[PDB]
């Protein structure tokens, strides 16, 4: 549940967020942090190090995808649920994929934010996302609820 | 941590310098405004933004960090009298560690973005989570 | 969801459950194996030692409730969400109490069970089990998603 | 750990004898059932009730849980190759190990009566979680 305050501060930070690179960026700090996440990407060819990971076309791709995918979610923050509904089916039943890692790519995406942005990333605009990336999380898990 | 988890995590504690204590204020407040529940710790604080008793508990967090970095291979045994406080005496639940190492981490990116490449940052999250282990390690 | 055999095997196992001291068992478990959960019961006395925390009468009534409230749960087992609504507010917005203790407090119970009854607590009624304090623990814990 | 909860668990593991192998197959049967998103860990595995590599793999867990028992004060030593194994082919998730552990509370639990004691079981709790961050220390 955001204020109206904190979802226009939401959408004034990620309309400038480069959506070619941010969430490239945030699925290889995944890999790199949390390397059995790495067990889902064996497809993704050469992971065995930070520098290849962060080089990965495929890990870049995919990255797009799931930034998409955020970007999808804030555009109906009130809708998150029925937003992944298909998404949530796809990363339960088809990938096994535990919920705990949906909030370790979160918090991964919210210090690539920090990262990108210094300053201007300020600890209200900061409360804001981690709401966004914990009902993003959230909706993402709800099949295993 | 492995040797190399030993040598991140030395130059980019030392590059934060003369700044800890001020990151580790700005840290606290980041974990005050984005998971409230941590607050409850803290009832007799003034935690309201620029505070004076926040600040010096973020330079007292930032010297026992600083000390951790200086005692890494000693860590257990230099946390001691720490682990005995929040352990026995505090009893902090151990996801709150999680979401100040999660804070700190966003401190440092937000502060030194040459520094935190991915590697830095594994480095960095693998430290902090032994550092919170051996505070919760009295339990 | 359970189906009707590991409805059967549980409510059977449940007939037989000892309602005075099985609930005091486990929150005595509960506060033992991890000791931060001491701090939400200071004013319920002695807790310094295992033996005073499985001998503290203000341990046994409270576990009692708590065991009540699972059984109230395992009466209506289609609705846990709206059976544990006033539970959920109470640990959530009053108590505060982190949502990870539910799932421990629940495997400590299962821990119990398997304790009392031996081989009686076969592999299968386990699983039966696990699933209802899952789904118990995500409904109590439904104020924070 | 505590010099009480290594006396604990090596007690209460010495009481386990000659069904360590017995346990460790129940303790797997138990994981399966329980959560079977573990099982996608064993595609080549026979998983059904009675398996025969269940029965193996369930002595090679608690022969590997008894060299560490045995190692208690050099667990990372002892445990080095399993968790290289663990870590870097297999990546299992660090869930997977919680999972176990509580599996294998369960089954001495309903094997040992008398041995499972309140603070027993924080001790072996405490034991299992050290030999699980052990084998994903890699990580
Ligand atoms: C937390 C928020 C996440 C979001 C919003 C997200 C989003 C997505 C999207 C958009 C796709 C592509 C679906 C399609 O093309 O049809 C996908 C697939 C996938 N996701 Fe995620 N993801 C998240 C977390 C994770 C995590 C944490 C992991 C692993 C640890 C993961 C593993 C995968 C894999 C392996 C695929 C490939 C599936 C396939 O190729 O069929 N996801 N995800
Ligand atoms: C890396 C993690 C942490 C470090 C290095 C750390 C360090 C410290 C230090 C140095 C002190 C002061 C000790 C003294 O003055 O003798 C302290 C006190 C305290 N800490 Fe932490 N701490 C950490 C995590 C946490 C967390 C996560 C919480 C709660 C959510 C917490 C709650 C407290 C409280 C309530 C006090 C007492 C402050 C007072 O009474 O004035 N700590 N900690
Ligand atoms: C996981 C399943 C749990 C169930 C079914 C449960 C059930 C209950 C019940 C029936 C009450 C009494 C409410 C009343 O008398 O109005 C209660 C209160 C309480 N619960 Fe729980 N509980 C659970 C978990 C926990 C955990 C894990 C903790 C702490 C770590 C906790 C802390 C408390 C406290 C401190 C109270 C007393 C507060 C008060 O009465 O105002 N509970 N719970
Ligand atoms: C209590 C902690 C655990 C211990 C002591 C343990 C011990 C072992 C041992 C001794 C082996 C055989 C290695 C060899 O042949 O030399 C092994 C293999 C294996 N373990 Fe574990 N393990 C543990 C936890 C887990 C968990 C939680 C999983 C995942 C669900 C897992 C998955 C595997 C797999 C997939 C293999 C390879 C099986 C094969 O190809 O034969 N282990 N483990």
């Given at each position: ?14 309309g ?8 490239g960026?945030?699925?290889?700090r ?19 190090t ?6 990965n ?5 995919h ?18 649920k ?15 994929v535990?919920?705990?890692n ?7 995406l919210?210090?690539?934010l920090?990262?990108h ?26 099949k295993?609820? | ?6 040598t991140?995590v ?52 930032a010297?026992?960090?600083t ?12 946390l001691?009298?720490?682990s005995?406080?929040?352990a ?13 190492s ?8 937000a ?20 550092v ?5 390690s009295?339990?």
């Amino acid at each position: 549940h955001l204020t109206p305050e904190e979802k226009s501060a939401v959408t004034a930070l990620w309309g400038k967020v480069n959506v070619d690179e941010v969430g490239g960026e945030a699925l290889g700090r995944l890999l790199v942090v949390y390397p059995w996440t790495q067990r889902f990407f064996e497809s993704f060819g050469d992971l065995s190090t930070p520098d290849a990971v962060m080089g990965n076309p495929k890990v870049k791709a995919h990255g797009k995808k799931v930034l998409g995918a955020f970007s999808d979610g804030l555009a109906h923050l009130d809708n998150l649920k029925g937003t992944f509904a298909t998404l949530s089916e796809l990363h339960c039943d088809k990938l096994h994929v535990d919920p705990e890692n949906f909030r370790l790519l979160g918090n991964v995406l919210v210090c690539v934010l920090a990262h990108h942005f210094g300053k201007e990333f300020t600890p209200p605009v900061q409360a804001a996302y981690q709401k966004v990336v914990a009902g993003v999380a959230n909706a993402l898990a709800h099949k295993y609820h | 941590l492995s040797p190399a988890d030993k040598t991140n995590v030395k130059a980019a504690w030392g590059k934060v310098g003369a700044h800890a204590g001020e990151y580790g204020a700005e840290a606290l407040e980041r974990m005050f405004l984005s998971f409230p529940t941590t607050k409850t710790y803290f009832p007799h604080f003034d935690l309201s933004h620029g505070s004076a008793q926040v600040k010096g508990h973020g330079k007292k967090v930032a010297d026992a960090l600083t000390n951790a970095v200086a005692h890494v291979d000693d860590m257990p045994n230099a946390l001691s009298a720490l682990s005995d406080l929040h352990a026995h005496k505090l009893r902090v639940d151990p996801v709150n560690f999680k979401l100040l190492s999660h804070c700190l981490l966003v401190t440092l990116a937000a502060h030194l973005p040459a520094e935190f490449t991915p590697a830095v940052h594994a480095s960095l999250d693998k430290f902090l989570a032994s550092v919170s282990t051996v505070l919760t390690s009295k339990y």
